[PDB]
Each structure stands twice: as C-alpha cells, then as structure tokens.
Design a protein around this ligand. Structure first.
Ligand SMILES: NS(=O)(=O)c1cc2c(cc1Cl)N[C@H]([C@H]1C[C@H]3C=C[C@@H]1C3)NS2(=O)=O
Ligand SMILES: NS(=O)(=O)c1cc2c(cc1Cl)N[C@H]([C@H]1C[C@H]3C=C[C@@H]1C3)NS2(=O)=O
Ligand SMILES: NS(=O)(=O)c1cc2c(cc1Cl)N[C@H]([C@H]1C[C@H]3C=C[C@@H]1C3)NS2(=O)=O
Ligand SMILES: NS(=O)(=O)c1cc2c(cc1Cl)N[C@H]([C@H]1C[C@H]3C=C[C@@H]1C3)NS2(=O)=O
Ligand SMILES: N[C@@H](CCC(=O)O)C(=O)O
Ligand SMILES: N[C@@H](CCC(=O)O)C(=O)O
Ligand SMILES: N[C@@H](CCC(=O)O)C(=O)O
Ligand SMILES: N[C@@H](CCC(=O)O)C(=O)O
Lengths: 260, 270, 270, 260
C-alpha cells in the first residue's frame, strides 16, 4: 500500500531537481525533507510517494469558517497520511493533528538587507521608519496574533493595520521584498530559513538579534493513526545517531557560498 | 486523589530553601521546577506533593538484570505519577515512558577551569587549552568524565562517531573514576583538579554554574549535540495529553522563557 | 444613565485616529486621555461617551460677564459630568470646580527653534540665544507669546515676580498678536518664525513636540514653576471621591507613568 | 480656640534650632514646615500651636490590628487637628484623612556613599552584594509592599527576608548606616530628603538613578473637618504666588554648604 506524503516546496527542505523535466516519480525532488523522508521510510519499512501540497500554505484556521488549509488541512481530512515538512509545532495544530518530537530547533529571527540601526526587537518596535512583515498562514503570524506580551501585541497591532498589505504570500516573495526595498523592509522568518538564505548567492541579507523565542519542526500524522509512534521513534533514533545533524550540515553549511 | 511529582535535587531547578527547617510541604523547595509545577497545576487543576528520589539518579538501566532505576525507574514501576525535573528525552526512555514536548533545550558541553589572564600591547586575553571535543579527545593530559546514570553516559556509550567513540573508550578504563555520582561533585572535582579535569554536562547547568560565584569555571567549544527536557509520564496515563498541551500553552505564553531568564541570568553575579 | 466626558483636541492626549471616518464611538479617538478614561472606568464601573468642546478652549474666566468658557466653562453649567483632559489645577478653577489629585506633573517651559550646529578641534557645538526666562525678558529681538484662554496666560497676568511681571507687561502690548489660539498654531509660529519667536507652554507638550518629526524645535531653560493635571468635576457631584481614589490607584499601580512612557518616549522618532 | 498642629522632627522641615533651651512654644522651632505653618495660619487667620508627634512615626496600620499610629493616628482619633509635615499622599491614608493638593513634589530615590556600578534600580535589584533598606512605617515600604510590578515585587521579597533587619527606625539612622557601611548599604528615601542630605557637610553621600515614581506631600486634616477647603486654598495660593518655591529655595539651596 502506498503512503501519501504531503510536503511543501521549501528550500533546502524540498527542491526541484536541476533536470527534473526528465524525471518522474520521487527522483525529481531533492532536499533535507526528501532525505528525512527516505530515512523515515527506510526505518519504518513503507513505500512512500512524495506529493506537493496543492496550495503553498503550511496551514491555519480561517476567520470564522473553522476550515484547515494547507498541509494541516491535507492531513485533517484524510487526503494525506503524513507530512514531512518544516511544520512548526503549535497549540492550535496540536489540538487537531499530532506532531512528533521536534527534529530541528528554531525560533523567530529578523532579516534585513546588509552600523545596524535596528538592534533587537525593542528598538525595532520603537521605530516606525522601518517596515517588517511575516508569512501569511504561518506560525509566526499566529504567534504574534495570540501574543499577550506588550511588545509583541504592539507589533501585531502595527502589522494588521498596515497599508498596503505587509504580509507576503511565500517566503521567496518576502526575501525578494527584503532585497528590493533598499534596507527599508524587514522580515520575520524562522531562523533556519534565514540562515540558508544568508549563506547563498548573492548573500546580501543578514540576521540581527537573537531569535524571539524557540520552537521545533515536527512530523505530522493524522490523529490516532498507527504511524505516530513509529515516526516518533524514527526521529529519536535519527537525532541520537547524528543523522539529523549530518543532514542539516550537508544542506546548510556544506555549500556555504559567501565570504565569511 | 493527589499525585506525587518526582524531582531531583539539582540547581537551579530545585534547591532546598534557606529557612526550610520549619517550612513544610510544597514551600520547602524553590527553583525552576517548582515554578513549572505551579504553572502546570494552574493550567490543569490537581493537588501535587513534591518528592525527591532516594538514590538521586536521573535514570538508566541495570546490566544483566534489565531494571530501570532513578527517576525513570520510579516512574516505570508505578511509584510515581509525573516527573517534573530536567529529564532528557532519549530513545531508551521513550520506549517505556512517555514524554511531553521539550520545555527547554540543551546540549552536551565541556567544563574546564577558567585560565589566567595572559599579560603579554597591554591587553589581557583568554588562552584556553581546549577548544572542541576533538582536541580534548586526542590529548592525554587533561582528563575528562561524566555523571553516572545520566543521559550523557549512555550517549557516549552507544555513539558511532569516531571522536565520541574514542572519548567513550578512554572513559571506560579511567583510573581513578572519571565519573561523578552527582553534578556538584563533578563541578567540585573541576574546581579542585587544578585545570587537569574537563567536565561533560548539559549546557543549562554549565551556564548556570559559569554565571555564579566564584565563577572560576567556563564552558568551552560548542555543543556536541542538541537535546531537550520534557515532563515524563508512565505509559498508559490520562496526564500525557493535558501535560503536553500545558507545555505548549506555557511555551507560547512565554512563561518558560521568563522562568529561565529569572533563574539563570537575572540572579547571576560575576 | 451614561456620563459625558469633555476633552480638548490635544496631542498626545486625544487625537483622531487615522481611519476615524469609518470608526464611530469611543473608538474614534486615541491618546493618553482615552485610555486614562478606559482605566478610570475599569476601576469604577460606568459607561461614558467622549466629547470634544466646541470652543476648543482649556478654560478661563472672562471679564465683565464673569462667564467661564472652554472645558471649565461647560463644566460649570452642567454640560458634562467629568473632564478627563490636561486641565491645570489653579486657584481660580479650584474655587469653582473640584479637582482630583494631579495625575501628571508639568511646568512652564520655553520653546525655541533649534539653532544650527556651530562649526567650531573638528567638533560641532550648539549655541542657543536663550538660556533662561531672564534673558528672554531682557532682550527685544526674540519675541514670545502664549496660548489664549489657558493657565499660562493667567499665570503671567497674576504674577508678582519682577521678571515674570516684565514678561507679562511686554506680552500685553504686542503687535501683532504674540498669543496663539491653539498649541499647534504656536508651534507652527515657532517653526516658521525663523528663530524670532519663543513659545511658552507646558513641558509635557513641549517634550512631546521636541521628540517628533521634524524636531526643529528646542526646549530651553528649566521649568518656570511646577503644576499638575487633574480630572476636574463640578462642585457637588458625587463622582469626586471615586475619581480621586481611582487616581491614587492608577498612580500607585504604576499605570499613569506607563501611559506617559508609551505615548511620549516609546514612539520617539528623533 | 487653639489649634493643635502635629508635626514630625524632620529636617529641613522642623528643627530644634540651636539654643532652644531658652525658647518656648512655637519660637523654639525652625524649618520649612514651620514657615509653611506660619503662612497657613496667616492666610486662614487662626492661632496655632506646633506639637511634635509623640512617636517618630509617619503613620501606618499595624499587622492584623487595624490601628493607626504616628501623625495619621494622631489625626484619626481627634488628638490632632492638622498635620503640617512631609506627609506622603497614598491610597490607604486618603481613605481615612483628607490630603490637600500636594505642596512639594517628590519620588522614591536611592542614596549611596561616594559613575556608580548600579545607577538604575534594575541593576540594584540584580546584584545582591550591596544591601539596601527603607524607613519603617513609611510610604516607600508601603509602596513596595503593595507593588504589583515584577521588579518592585522582587525588591519587596528580598527586603522582607533580610537578616538582620534592613529597615531603619529613623532616616537619621538610615543616613548614618549609608555612611558607616563603606558603600555596601543603599537607602530608599524621598528625593527631597536625599537632596538635603547630599547638600550638607560632609557631603559623603550621593543620589543615583532616576525616580522610581512621583508623589507629593499633603497637609492632613481629620475626615470631615472644616479646615479642609481653607488649607487647600491656602496651599494653592502659596504655590501660585511662588511662596513654596521660595521656601524650598531658602531651606534647600540658600545655605548650599558643599562644593558643587
Ligand atoms: N542542531 S539541529 O537544529 O539540526 C537539531 C535539533 C534537534 C535535534 C537534533 C538536531 Cl541535529 N533533536 C531534538 C529531539 C531529540 C530529543 C530531544 C528533543 C527532541 C527529542 N529536537 S531538536 O532539539 O529540535
Ligand atoms: N528558551 S527555553 O529553553 O526556556 C524554550 C525551549 C523550548 C521551547 C520554548 C522555550 Cl521558551 N518550545 C519547544 C516546544 C514548543 C513547541 C515546539 C517544540 C516544542 C513544542 N521546546 S523547546 O525548543 O525545548
Ligand atoms: N510621571 S507622571 O507625570 O505621569 C505622574 C505624576 C504624578 C503622579 C504619578 C505620575 Cl506617574 N502621582 C501624584 C498623586 C499621587 C499621590 C501623591 C500626589 C498625587 C496624589 N500626582 S503627580 O505628582 O502629578
Ligand atoms: N518645586 S517644588 O517641589 O517646591 C513644588 C511642587 C509643587 C508645587 C509647587 C512647588 Cl514650588 N505646586 C503643586 C500644586 C499646585 C497646584 C498644581 C498641583 C498642586 C495644585 N504641587 S507640586 O507640583 O508637588
Ligand atoms: N514552516 C512554518 C511557517 C513558515 C514561517 O513561519 O516562516 C510552519 O509550519 O508554521
Ligand atoms: N539531564 C540528564 C543528566 C545530566 C547528565 O547526564 O549529564 C538526564 O536527564 O539524565
Ligand atoms: N493645561 C493648560 C493649557 C496649557 C496652556 O494654557 O499653556 C490649561 O489648563 O489651561
Ligand atoms: N514622609 C513619608 C515617609 C518617610 C520616607 O518615606 O522617607 C511619609 O509621610 O509617608
């Protein structure tokens, strides 16, 4: 029996191969999530088929509709069996889907173009000269929306009352907006994506401040499924054996094309 | 019915209070873990009484008997209901007991005695003999050791990376014993061992000791791996889901961050 | 029964919101006074609707007709129940209407246009033409004025200190009118008047304007006196005691300084 | 009819002159509060008799007794008619006596022995090497006891669990303890007292940090007294005419016995 693996097109997690138009099947994708999925399948023993989620959204609940979109929606409704992707572990997701022990740690970073008049998030919040945005239907936007600290609440109040819309459709759009806004635009993305972007050509962006909090990426599976404990133990073995560290090193610092 | 919360005596998670000769109950102890238990009960209401393991061991397995001891040992054989203490999430433990999502992240580090200020324009710089685990593995002068019945001892026992394999091979036949029965014994052996002993321990404890008087020890290199701390619970329990959801609630609410900042860096001196 | 609250259009006390056209009710306005009224209602429960006085005057007793105008003017004749706005506690006002304890301290300052940086080793210095109120009184080049129907105009009218008496005597015979009908008119006269005009106004407004774009204005000297802002109430209304106790609660709970820090220094452009 | 005025032996508010053994009545006292009382009596038109409060207490409620002591207790129980003294306006006091509009602004300050390594209050809260205390039965200790902010609650928790007792009976004892503890002891006193102390021989103490809050000193009368509105209007007139400014200048800087 096949196993549908709903993923996202995120780099270096899943990529299009350099000659992917001559390849059909699982061979046409490469990345950290593909290698992770291969090791999960090898440890468990199931034949898997990588599929891309239909809408490039990780997943959230709509405004007064109670419908899950994206990969989480792909999982709740049974169209998907497992989600090996940069899926952030949260409360709202845990109430409807079950994660694994996180396989990669991360936080909320800040990305700007290359004196550093921003400093940490406090000085970022004090000044309205510089603009900043997040990814719609993500964990960072919902982190700010539900935040009860003063600084984060003021940040969220700014973000919702911004014209034109400051939220970006994809992280590629957000990075392009950081690059093309001559230092006026800032990005609140997950620190792992920030590092990968800051290590690649043309390498004109850099990360300031520490991460605002700390989270993890989990491997999702429908509630009550029989794939929960096996993938949990798979993640634990992969972390204890250094495989997860090795894959992050291969896909994050092995190439490392910039001067530093 | 009340539940028993098993906990180790380790700073700054749980330290016996100064005037604890006459306080009784949950008020005898203080630290990070007691605040975590307070917030856990605040999320979901339950009566809890703190307990400390008799052997004071974190948890591992006996050999040729296959017995769990320590905190995990008490949790396996029913004598505990929940272990709110810095218990590391591992493969062997996850099989027999359940874990919440980690409430704090960590990593194995190396502790050495802080070096002197090298005088030779008129600038003082830090000069250390160890900068990673590779050079600590190759050299045979500066000894090193771990905490008995911990997660790091098992980590080195079953690892396949060559440098960690050599480190374990050295540790297994070190006379006198390089292992320490407690965290404080290891740190004191570092302090008294005249810079001839390097201690392998979690980065949270290492940072905490580094930022407190007399602050003559420092953490070197980087973390050899990444792990976490969760609230354990025996297999087949009704507390697993409420505990995990409480962990997520506390993480998004930022209470864990405040607790760490106020028990690790806000009270630190020197 | 709901109470009506009289308030002036002043910054950062009550400013119409950016999208105030589509918003209606207490959501139209924002600033220090709005959330001060919010916390006042939270402490002692009542329903309130905000208003802005049609004359836009702070309140001063006219001659001949002996009629109060402005905020105090409408508060004398029962057109409001509580005035949450920067109303200055004076002698003439207190004998007619009641005040709470001051919720914010202030004092008369001088606003001048910020001079250009003096070129003269390679350091830039600031040389200002005014350093106190004495030199402002002596010279006859740099003109000065105040806000009509305010506490400052009365303060200079009623004072007996020799230097303040001279300042008032000069102000009364000033062609053209050195008096301004609003705070913004005075500050614009300062910014346009190319350093020939010095504005006398409260230090709270002066600091707030100094910290915003284009910050071409400077506050010189120290405070000429010391006064405060209280929540006014008509003489006889039972609201006076709850209002006073609410002021004390908010001050000791450290929220008045919080609102001041958030609306004055936190959003500091310059 | 005579008017009993309950004051407190505080400098420069009330002093015992220098040769008081040959003087009687109001003529054996000198200070800012004495001059203020003279101005009040002149404005209202009443003969007054200055009386030192029996115990050097400003006023508070006992622990689980609900009895007022000091000047506030002197007024509540009808033994006193008016209290011209450095009496801080608070919530608990306002519920039992009437305060006029404040006549002298002030706040909570820190004095230390003679750039400080602490300065602001957060640093003073972090470092436990250096001790600090307040005046018992005051408003500063009351301010810390009921404070709901994090830093001030931490300060109060430290202060109550201090051995030996860090609280002082008199501000004279507190200043002597700041001077005699070789820079190891800090003090939390009102800014006005701190300035008067720092402007006097031997000028060995200095004030650091900003004001923790801002308060005022009021003129107390018993609840429902006929002397409330007249003394209120007297304070307002005195402030509007510059008399309070002049008296503070006379008793705080006119002498100015220090090198600065
Ligand atoms: N260095 S890293 O970001 O690639 C990374 C991050 C993590 C790893 C392993 C690696 Cl290599 N394992 C942990 C897991 C291991 C056990 C303890 C926490 C979870 C369960 N999650 S993690 O702390 O998010
Ligand atoms: N800064 S810290 O060590 O107190 C800390 C550590 C961690 C936090 C949150 C904080 Cl504040 N969240 C994660 C949890 C939150 C959700 C995502 C990963 C797990 C489930 N565990 S963690 O990565 O171990
Ligand atoms: N920092 S500020 O100007 O917003 C400010 C100003 C003042 C505050 C409190 C604050 Cl936060 N409290 C006092 C009040 C408190 C008690 C003592 C004097 C009055 C009654 N009024 S005040 O001296 O005018
Ligand atoms: N400069 S000072 O401390 O001597 C000082 C302090 C103050 C003064 C007058 C002086 Cl001189 N008057 C005010 C009062 C006057 C009117 C406005 C606020 C109260 C009622 N109280 S105050 O703001 O606490
Ligand atoms: N991958 C994240 C969202 C991406 C982002 O926050 O930038 C998630 O699963 O929630
Ligand atoms: N925290 C570890 C113990 C520390 C160590 O072994 O270094 C555990 O859960 O076992
Ligand atoms: N607060 C002052 C207004 C400021 C001014 O008039 O200068 C008043 O009540 O009149
Ligand atoms: N004078 C203050 C107390 C003295 C002090 O706090 O230093 C009061 O009346 O509350």
């Amino acid at each position: 029996k096949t196993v549908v693996v709903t993923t996202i097109l995120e780099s270096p997690y899943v990529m299009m191969k350099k000659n992917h138009e001559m390849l059909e099947g699982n061979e046409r994708y490469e990345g950290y999530c593909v290698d992770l999925a291969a090791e999960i399948a090898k440890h468990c023993g199931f034949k898997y088929k990588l599929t891309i989620v239909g809408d490039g959204k990780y997943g959230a609940r709509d405004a007064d509709t109670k419908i899950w979109n994206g990969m989480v929606g792909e999982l709740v409704y049974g169209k998907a069996d497992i989600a090996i992707a940069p899926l952030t572990i949260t409360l709202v997701r845990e109430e409807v889907i079950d994660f694994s022990k996180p396989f990669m740690s991360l936080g909320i970073s800040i990305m700007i173009k290359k004196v550093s008049p921003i400093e940490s998030a406090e000085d970022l919040s004090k000044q309205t000269e510089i603009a900043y945005g997040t990814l719609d239907s993500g964990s960072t936007k919902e982190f700010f929306r539900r935040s009860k600290i003063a600084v984060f609440d003021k940040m969220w109040t700014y973000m919702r009352s911004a014209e034109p819309s400051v939220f970006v459709r994809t992280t590629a759009e957000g990075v392009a907006r950081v690059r093309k806004s001559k230092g006026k635009y800032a990005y609140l993305l997950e620190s792992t994506m920030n590092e990968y972007i800051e290590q690649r050509k043309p390498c004109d962006t850099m990360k300031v401040g520490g991460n605002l909090d700390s989270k993890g990426y989990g491997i999702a599976t429908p509630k009550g499924s029989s794939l929960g404990t096996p993938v949990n133990l798979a993640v634990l073995k992969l972390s204890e054996q250094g495989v997860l560290d090795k894959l992050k090193n291969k896909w994050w610092y092995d190439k490392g094309e910039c001067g530093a």
